[PDB]
Coordinates of C-alpha atoms and ligand atoms in Angstrom, one line a residue:
X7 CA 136.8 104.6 104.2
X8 CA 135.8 105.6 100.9
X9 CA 132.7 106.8 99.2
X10 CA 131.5 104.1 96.9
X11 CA 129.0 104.1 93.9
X12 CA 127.3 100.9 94.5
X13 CA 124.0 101.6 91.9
X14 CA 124.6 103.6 88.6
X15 CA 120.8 104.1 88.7
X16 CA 118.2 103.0 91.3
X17 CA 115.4 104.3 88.7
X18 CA 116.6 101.2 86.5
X19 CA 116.6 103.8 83.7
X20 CA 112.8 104.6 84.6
X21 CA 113.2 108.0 85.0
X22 CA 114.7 111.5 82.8
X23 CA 117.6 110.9 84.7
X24 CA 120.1 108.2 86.6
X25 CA 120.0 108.5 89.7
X26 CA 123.1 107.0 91.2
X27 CA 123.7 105.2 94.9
X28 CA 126.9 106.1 96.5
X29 CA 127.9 105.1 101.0
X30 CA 130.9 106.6 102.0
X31 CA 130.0 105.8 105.4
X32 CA 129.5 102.7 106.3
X33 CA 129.1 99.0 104.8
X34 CA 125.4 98.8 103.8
X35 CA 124.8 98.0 100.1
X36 CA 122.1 99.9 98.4
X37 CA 118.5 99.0 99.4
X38 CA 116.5 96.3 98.1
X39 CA 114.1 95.8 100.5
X40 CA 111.7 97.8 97.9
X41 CA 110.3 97.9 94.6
X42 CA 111.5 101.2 92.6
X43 CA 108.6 101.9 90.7
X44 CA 108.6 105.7 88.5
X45 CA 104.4 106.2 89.0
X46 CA 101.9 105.4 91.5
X47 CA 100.7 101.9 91.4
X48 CA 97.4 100.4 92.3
X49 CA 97.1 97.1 94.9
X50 CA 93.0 97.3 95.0
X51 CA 90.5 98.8 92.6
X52 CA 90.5 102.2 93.3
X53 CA 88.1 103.3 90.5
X54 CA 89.7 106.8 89.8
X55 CA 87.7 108.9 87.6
X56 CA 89.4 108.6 84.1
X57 CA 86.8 109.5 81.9
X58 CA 88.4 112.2 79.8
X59 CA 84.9 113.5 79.0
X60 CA 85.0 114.3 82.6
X61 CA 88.2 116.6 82.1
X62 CA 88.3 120.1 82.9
X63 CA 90.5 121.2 80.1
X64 CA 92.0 124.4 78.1
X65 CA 90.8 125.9 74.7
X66 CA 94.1 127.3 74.1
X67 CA 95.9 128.0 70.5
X68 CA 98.9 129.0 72.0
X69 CA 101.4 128.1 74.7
X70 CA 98.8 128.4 77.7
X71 CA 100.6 131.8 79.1
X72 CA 97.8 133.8 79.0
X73 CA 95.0 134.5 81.7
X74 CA 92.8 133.1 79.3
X75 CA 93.6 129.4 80.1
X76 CA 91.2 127.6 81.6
X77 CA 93.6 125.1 83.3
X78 CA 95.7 128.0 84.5
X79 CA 92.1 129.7 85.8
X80 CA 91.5 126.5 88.1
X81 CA 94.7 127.1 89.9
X82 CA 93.5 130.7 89.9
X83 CA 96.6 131.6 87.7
X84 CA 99.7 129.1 86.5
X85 CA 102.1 129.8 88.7
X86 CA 105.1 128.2 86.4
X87 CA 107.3 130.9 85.0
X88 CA 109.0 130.5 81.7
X89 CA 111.5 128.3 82.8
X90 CA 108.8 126.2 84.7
X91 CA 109.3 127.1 88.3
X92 CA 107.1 128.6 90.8
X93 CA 106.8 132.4 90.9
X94 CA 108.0 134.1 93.9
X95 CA 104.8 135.0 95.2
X96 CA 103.4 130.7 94.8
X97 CA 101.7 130.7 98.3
X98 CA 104.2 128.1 100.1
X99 CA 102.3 127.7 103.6
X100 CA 99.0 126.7 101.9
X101 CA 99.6 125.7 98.2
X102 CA 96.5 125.9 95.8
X103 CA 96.1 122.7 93.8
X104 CA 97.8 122.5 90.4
X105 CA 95.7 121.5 87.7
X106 CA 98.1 120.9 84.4
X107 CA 96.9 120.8 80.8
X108 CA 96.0 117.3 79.4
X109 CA 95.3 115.4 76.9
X110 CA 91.7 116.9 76.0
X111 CA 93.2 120.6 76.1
X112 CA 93.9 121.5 72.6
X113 CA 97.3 122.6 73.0
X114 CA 100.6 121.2 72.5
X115 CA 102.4 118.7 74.7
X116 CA 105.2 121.3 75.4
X117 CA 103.3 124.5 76.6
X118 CA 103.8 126.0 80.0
X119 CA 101.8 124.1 81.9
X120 CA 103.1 120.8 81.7
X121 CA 105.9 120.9 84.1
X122 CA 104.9 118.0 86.8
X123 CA 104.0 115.3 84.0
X124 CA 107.2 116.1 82.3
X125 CA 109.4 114.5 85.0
X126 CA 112.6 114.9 86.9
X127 CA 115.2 116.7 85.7
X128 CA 117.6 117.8 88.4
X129 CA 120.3 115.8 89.1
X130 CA 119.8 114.0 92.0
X131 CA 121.9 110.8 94.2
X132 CA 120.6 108.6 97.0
X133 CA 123.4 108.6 99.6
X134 CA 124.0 107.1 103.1
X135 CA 124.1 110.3 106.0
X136 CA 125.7 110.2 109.2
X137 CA 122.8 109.4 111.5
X138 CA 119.6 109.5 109.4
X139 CA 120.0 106.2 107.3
X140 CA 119.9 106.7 103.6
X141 CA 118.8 110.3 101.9
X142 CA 118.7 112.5 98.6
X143 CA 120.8 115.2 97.8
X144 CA 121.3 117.4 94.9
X145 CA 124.3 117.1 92.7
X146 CA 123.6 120.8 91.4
X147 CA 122.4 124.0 92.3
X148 CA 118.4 124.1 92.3
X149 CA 116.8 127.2 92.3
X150 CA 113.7 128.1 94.4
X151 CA 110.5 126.8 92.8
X152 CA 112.1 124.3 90.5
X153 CA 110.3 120.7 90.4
X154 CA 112.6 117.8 92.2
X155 CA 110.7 114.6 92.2
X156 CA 106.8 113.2 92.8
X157 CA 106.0 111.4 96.2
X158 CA 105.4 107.8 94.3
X159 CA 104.3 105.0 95.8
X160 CA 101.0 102.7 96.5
X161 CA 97.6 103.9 96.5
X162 CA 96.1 102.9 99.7
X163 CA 92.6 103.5 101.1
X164 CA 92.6 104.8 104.7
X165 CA 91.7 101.8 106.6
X166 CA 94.0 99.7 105.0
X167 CA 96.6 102.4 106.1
X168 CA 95.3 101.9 109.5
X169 CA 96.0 98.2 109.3
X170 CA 99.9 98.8 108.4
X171 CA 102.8 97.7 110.5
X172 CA 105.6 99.8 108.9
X173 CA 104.1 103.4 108.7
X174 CA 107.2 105.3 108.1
X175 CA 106.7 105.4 104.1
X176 CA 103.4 106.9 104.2
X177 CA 101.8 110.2 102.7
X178 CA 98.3 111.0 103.3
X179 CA 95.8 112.4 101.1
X180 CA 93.6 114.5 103.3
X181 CA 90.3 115.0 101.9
X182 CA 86.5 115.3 103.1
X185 CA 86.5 108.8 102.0
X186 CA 90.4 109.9 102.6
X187 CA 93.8 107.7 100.6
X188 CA 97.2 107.7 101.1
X189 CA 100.4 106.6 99.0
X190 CA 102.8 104.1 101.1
X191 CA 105.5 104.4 99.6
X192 CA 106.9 101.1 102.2
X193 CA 106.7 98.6 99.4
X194 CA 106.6 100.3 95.9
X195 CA 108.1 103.8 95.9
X196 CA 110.6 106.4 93.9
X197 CA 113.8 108.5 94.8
X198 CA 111.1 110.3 97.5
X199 CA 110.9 107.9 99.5
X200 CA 114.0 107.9 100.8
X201 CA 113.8 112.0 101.7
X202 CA 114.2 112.7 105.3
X203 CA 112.9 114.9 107.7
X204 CA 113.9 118.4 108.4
X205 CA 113.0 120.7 110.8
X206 CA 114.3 123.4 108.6
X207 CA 112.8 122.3 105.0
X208 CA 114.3 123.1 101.3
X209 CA 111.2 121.5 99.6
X210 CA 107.2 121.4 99.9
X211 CA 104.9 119.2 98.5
X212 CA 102.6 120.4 96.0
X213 CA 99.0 118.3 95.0
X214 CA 99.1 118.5 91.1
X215 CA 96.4 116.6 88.6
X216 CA 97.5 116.0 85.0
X217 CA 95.8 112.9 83.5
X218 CA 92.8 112.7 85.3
X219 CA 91.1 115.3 87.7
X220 CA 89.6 112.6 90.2
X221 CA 90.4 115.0 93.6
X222 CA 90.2 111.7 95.9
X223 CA 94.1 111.3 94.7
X224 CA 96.0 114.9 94.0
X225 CA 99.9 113.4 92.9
X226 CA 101.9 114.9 95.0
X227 CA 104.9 117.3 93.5
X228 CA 108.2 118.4 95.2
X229 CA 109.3 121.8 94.3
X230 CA 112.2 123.6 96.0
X231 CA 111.3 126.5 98.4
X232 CA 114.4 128.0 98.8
X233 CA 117.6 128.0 96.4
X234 CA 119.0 124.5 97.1
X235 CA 123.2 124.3 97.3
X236 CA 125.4 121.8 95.2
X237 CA 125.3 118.7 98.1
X238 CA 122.9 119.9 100.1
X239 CA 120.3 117.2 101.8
X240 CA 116.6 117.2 100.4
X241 CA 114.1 117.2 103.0
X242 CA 110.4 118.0 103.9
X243 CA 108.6 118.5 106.8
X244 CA 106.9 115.3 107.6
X245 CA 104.5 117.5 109.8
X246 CA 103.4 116.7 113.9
X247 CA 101.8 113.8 113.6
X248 CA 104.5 111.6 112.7
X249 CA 106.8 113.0 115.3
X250 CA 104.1 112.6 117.8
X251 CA 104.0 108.9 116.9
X252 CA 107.9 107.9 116.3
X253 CA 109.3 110.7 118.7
X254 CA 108.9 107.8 121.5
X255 CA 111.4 105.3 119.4
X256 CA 113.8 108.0 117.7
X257 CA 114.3 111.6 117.9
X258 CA 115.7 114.3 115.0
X259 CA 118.9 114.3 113.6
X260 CA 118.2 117.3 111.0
X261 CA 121.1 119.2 113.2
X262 CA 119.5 121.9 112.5
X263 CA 119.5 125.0 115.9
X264 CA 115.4 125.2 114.7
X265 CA 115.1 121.7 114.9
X266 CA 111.8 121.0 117.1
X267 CA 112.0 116.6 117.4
X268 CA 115.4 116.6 118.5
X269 CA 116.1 114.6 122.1
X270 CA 117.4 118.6 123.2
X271 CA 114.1 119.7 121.9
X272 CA 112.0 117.4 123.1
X273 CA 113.6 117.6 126.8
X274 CA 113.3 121.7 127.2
X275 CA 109.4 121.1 126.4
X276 CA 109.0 118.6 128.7
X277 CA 110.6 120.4 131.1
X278 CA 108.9 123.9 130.2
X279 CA 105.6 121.9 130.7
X280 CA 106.4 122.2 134.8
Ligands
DXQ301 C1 104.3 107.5 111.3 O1 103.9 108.5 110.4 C2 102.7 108.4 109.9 C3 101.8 107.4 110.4 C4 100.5 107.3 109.8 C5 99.6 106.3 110.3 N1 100.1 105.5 111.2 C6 99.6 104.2 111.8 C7 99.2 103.1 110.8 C8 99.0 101.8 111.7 N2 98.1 102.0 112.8 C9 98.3 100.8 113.7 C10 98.2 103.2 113.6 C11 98.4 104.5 112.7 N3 98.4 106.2 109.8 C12 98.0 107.1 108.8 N4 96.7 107.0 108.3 C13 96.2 108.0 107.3 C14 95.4 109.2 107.8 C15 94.8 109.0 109.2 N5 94.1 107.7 109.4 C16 92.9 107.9 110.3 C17 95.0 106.8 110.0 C18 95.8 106.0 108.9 N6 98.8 108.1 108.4 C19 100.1 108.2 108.8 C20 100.9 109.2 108.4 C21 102.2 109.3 108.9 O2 103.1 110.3 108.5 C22 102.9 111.0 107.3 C23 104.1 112.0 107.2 C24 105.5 111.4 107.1 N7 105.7 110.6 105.9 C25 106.0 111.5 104.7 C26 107.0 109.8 106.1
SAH302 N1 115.1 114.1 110.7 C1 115.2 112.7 110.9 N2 115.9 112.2 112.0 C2 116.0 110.9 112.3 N3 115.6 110.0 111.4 C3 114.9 110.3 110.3 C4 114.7 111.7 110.0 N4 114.0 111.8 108.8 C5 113.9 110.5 108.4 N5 114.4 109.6 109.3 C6 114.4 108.1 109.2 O1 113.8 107.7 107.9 C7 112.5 107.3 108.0 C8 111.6 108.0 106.9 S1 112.0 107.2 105.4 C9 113.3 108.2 104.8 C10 114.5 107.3 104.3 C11 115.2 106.6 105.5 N6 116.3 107.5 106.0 C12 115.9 105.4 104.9 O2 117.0 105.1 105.2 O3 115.2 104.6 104.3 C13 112.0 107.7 109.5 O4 111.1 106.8 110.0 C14 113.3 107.6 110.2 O5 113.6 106.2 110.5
CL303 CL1 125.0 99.4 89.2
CL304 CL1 84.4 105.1 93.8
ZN305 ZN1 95.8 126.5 78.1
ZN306 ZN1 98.4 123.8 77.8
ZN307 ZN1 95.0 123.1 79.4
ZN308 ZN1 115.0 118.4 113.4

């Protein structure tokens, strides 16, 4: 059986990049039960806050990459380097939010805080795994900090999330009224990253355009050096093992892998 490419692009040229569909495991064509969509889209009124009067924004006349810089001051520093990853010390158990400049900071379009809103640029293919379905892995080395991809998908409030069937696409927005993006019927290339219990990326809440905090976009970035091949995956956190545990179990393979059948046995039986 051979690997097959069987999309030159599941973006439909939408994003920086192609990203490319290839199975060489089974007979399953590339999804289409979906709509690829590059931003978050709206199915109600949601009534974000875009009033750029309302904008927190920079008075910079440089490249933002001094302490001076407002937008860099609400994330208590920017935390992009010059190459526009992370620094070493970004705190990656409890990330501070990410506020990037905008359109009413006065500076340039291509300073040093822009990284999110300028979109993917690793090089990355949707592929079919050995037990987990479909998933994303990179076609390059990707070192820690870099930005992968945005959790896309449909703005939901949370009681329509509660109403649901298919609750496998969904990140929440925690907040203190609370959204989430279901990324079921209108989602990116992050919608088909899976689980592990061992993660090489964290999301990040970022705000570019507008700084309504009801809905933070939500930013991949690497938190290790990523291999040439290697699977993408996130933690998808307790609560949705505590669901779905019951109808599947963990496949990451990993020997710190905490949902696995294995796993999930030795606690039950530790329990007695
Ligand atoms: C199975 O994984 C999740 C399920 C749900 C869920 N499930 C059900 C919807 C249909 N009803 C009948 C019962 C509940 N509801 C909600 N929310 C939003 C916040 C809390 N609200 C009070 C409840 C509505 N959030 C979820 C988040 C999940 O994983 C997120 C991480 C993994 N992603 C990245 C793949
Ligand atoms: N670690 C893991 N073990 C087993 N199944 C997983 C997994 N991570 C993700 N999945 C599967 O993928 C769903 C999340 S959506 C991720 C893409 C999915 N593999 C697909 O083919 O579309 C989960 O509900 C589960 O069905
Ligand atoms: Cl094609
Ligand atoms: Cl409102
Ligand atoms: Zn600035
Ligand atoms: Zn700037
Ligand atoms: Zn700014
Ligand atoms: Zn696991």
């Amino acid at each position: 059986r051979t690997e097959k490419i069987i999309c030159r692009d599941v973006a439909r040229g939408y994003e920086n990049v192609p990203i490319p569909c290839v199975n060489g495991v089974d007979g399953e064509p590339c999804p289409e039960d979906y709509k690829y969509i590059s931003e978050n889209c709206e199915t109600s009124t949601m009534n974000i806050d875009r009033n750029i009067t309302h904008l927190q924004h920079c008075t910079c006349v440089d490249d933002c990459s001094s302490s001076n810089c407002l937008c860099g001051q609400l994330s208590i520093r920017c935390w992009y380097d010059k190459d526009g990853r992370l620094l070493q010390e970004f705190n990656k158990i409890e990330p501070p939010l990410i506020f990037e400049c905008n359109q009413a900071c006065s500076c340039w379009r291509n300073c040093k805080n822009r990284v999110v809103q300028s979109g993917i640029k690793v090089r990355l293919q949707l592929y079919r795994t050995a037990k987990m379905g479909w998933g994303v892995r990179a076609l390059q080395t990707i070192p820690q900090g870099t930005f992968i991809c945005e959790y896309v998908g449909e703005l939901i409030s949370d009681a329509e999330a509660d109403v649901r069937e298919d609750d496998s696409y969904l990140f929440d927005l925690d907040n203190k009224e609370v959204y989430c993006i279901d990324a079921r019927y209108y989602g990116n290339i992050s919608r088909f990253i899976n689980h592990l219990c061992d993660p090489n990326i964290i999301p990040v809440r970022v705000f570019m355009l507008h700084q309504d905090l009801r809905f933070p976009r939500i930013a991949f970035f690497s938190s290790r050096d990523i291999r040439t091949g290697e699977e993408l995956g996130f933690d998808y956190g307790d609560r949705f093992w505590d669901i779905k545990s019951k109808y599947f179990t963990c496949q990451c393979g990993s020997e710190k892998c905490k949902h696995s059948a294995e796993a999930i046995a030795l606690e039950q039986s530790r329990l007695a």
